[PDB]
Amino acid sequence: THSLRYFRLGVSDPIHGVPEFISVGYVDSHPITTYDSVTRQKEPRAPWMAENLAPDHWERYTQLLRGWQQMFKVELKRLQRHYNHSGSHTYQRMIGCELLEDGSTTGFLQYAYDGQDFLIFNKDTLSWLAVDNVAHTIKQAWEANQHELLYQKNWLEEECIAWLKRFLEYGKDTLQRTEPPLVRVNRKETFPGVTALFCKAHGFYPPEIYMTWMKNGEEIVQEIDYGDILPSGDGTYQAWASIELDPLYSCHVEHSGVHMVLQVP
Amino acid sequence: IQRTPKIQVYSRHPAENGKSNFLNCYVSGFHPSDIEVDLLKNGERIEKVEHSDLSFSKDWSFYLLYYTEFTPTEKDEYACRVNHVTLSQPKIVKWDR
Numbered sequence: 001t002h003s004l005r006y007f008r009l010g011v012s013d014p015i016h017g018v019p020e021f022i023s024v025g026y027v028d029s030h031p032i033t034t035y036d037s038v039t040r041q042k043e044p045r046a047p048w049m050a051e052n053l054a055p056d057h058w059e060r061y062t063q064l065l066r067g068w069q070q071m072f073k074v075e076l077k078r079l080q081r082h083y084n085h086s087g088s089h090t091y092q093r094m095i096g097c098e099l100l101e102d103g104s105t106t107g108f109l110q111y112a113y114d115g116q117d118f119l120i121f122n123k124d125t126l127s128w129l130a131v132d133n134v135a136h137t138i139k140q141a142w143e144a145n146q147h148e149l150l151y152q153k154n155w156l157e158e159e160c161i162a163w164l165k166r167f168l169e170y171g172k173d174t175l176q177r178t179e180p181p182l183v184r185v186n187r188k189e190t191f192p193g194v195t196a197l198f199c200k201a202h203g204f205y206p207p208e209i210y211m212t213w214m215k216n217g218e219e220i221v222q223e224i225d226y227g228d229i230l231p232s233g234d235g236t237y238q239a240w241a242s243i244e245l246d247p248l249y250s251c252h253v254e255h256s257g258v259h260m261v262l263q264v265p
Numbered sequence: 266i267q268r269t270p271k272i273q274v275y276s277r278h279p280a281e282n283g284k285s286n287f288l289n290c291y292v293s294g295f296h297p298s299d300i301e302v303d304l305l306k307n308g309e310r311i312e313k314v315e316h317s318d319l320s321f322s323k324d325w326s327f328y329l330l331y332y333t334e335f336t337p338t339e340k341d342e343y344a345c346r347v348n349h350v351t352l353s354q355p356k357i358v359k360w361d362r
C-alpha cells in the first residue's frame with residue numbers, strides 16, 4: 001500500500017533554524033531527495049537513488065526547484081500582506097499519491113499557512129477549496145490558468161504513480177515488507193512497590209504493527225498503556241505495550257500476516 | 266496555532282552495559298519548525314550529535330530524530346533537553362532503563 005510524497009517549506013525571518021526554503025521527497029517512510037535555499041541543488045538521500053538515476057534528472061529538477069524557490073518566496077510575502085502579518089511565518093505545500101494493494105490509486109495536493117489548511121486541490125473537479133477570503137482571491141487567480149490545473153491533475157493521475165513504480169523497482173527494502181519483530185517480555189517496577197509487565201517488540205519492517213496485553217484471554221484496553229511505533233535509525237522500528245500487575249497474563253502481536261502470543265511465567 | 270512537542274528518549278537496540286548502542290531523542294508534533302535539541306550525559310552536553318531529515322506529518326506538524334553512539338555504563342545518567350517557542354523553560358527528559 002506504498003506512497004510517494006514531496007513537500008515544500010518556506011519561513012520568513014529564521015534567526016537560527018533557517019533556511020527559508022526546503023524540499024524533501026519520500027517513498028513511504030524513506031527520504032529519497034533533498035533541496036534547500038543554501039545548497040541550491042537537488043540531491044539523493046538514498047543509495048539506490050544515486051545509482052539508477054542519470055545526471056540529467058538531477059540537473060533538470062535542480063533548475064525547476066530554483067524557480068519554485070522564488071515562487072514560494074513571492075507567494076508567502078503576498079500572504080502576510082493580505083493579512084496584517086509581520087515577523088516570521090510558515091508556508092507549506094504537499095503533493096504525492098498512493099498505490100493501494102487492490103490496484104486503485106489516490107493522489108493529493110494541499111497548502112498551509114502557519115500550519116493551518118489554506119488551499120486543498122480536488123483533481124476530479126479541477127477546483128480549489130479555499131479556507132478564507134485571502135485563499136479565495138489566490139484560488140481565483142489559479143483557476144484562470146487551466147493548463148496548470150491540468151498539469152497538476154495529470155502529474156498525480158499519471159506521472160506520479162509511474163515514478164513511484166520506478167522507485168519501487170529500486171527497492172530491496174522498500175518492496176521488501178518482511179522484517180519480523182523480535183518480541184520479549186520483561187517485568188519493570190513502574191511505581192514502588194508496583195510491578196508492570198512490559199512487552200517490547202523491535203527490529204521489524206514495515207512500521208505497521210499491532211500489540212496488546214490480555215488478562216485470562218480478555219483484552220482490557222483501560223488497564224493497558226500503549227507505546228508509539230518509533231524509528232530506530234537502522235531502518236527498522238520498535239514499539240511496546242504495558243500492563244499493571246495486581247497482587248494469567250499473555251502478550252499478543254500481529255505483523256505482515258505473522259501472529260504471535262507470548263506468555264509470562 | 267502553536268503546538269508543544271512530544272519528547273521521547275530511548276535506545277536503538279535493547280540496553281546492555283559495556284556494548285555499543287545509540288541514544289535516540291524523537292521530537293514530534295510541534296509548530297513552528299524552530300526547535301533546539303541537545304543530548305545529555307551526567308548533566309554535561311554531548312558534543313557530537315547527528316540528526317534526521319526534518320519531515321512534516323499531514324497535520325503540518327514536524328518531527329525529527331536526534332541520535333548519538335554511546336556505550337551504556339552502569340552509573341551513567343542520560344537525558345534529553347528540548348526548547349521550543351511554546352516552552353518558557355527547556356524540558357529535560359531522562360532516559361529510562
Ligand SMILES: [Cl-]
Ligand atoms: Cl507547480
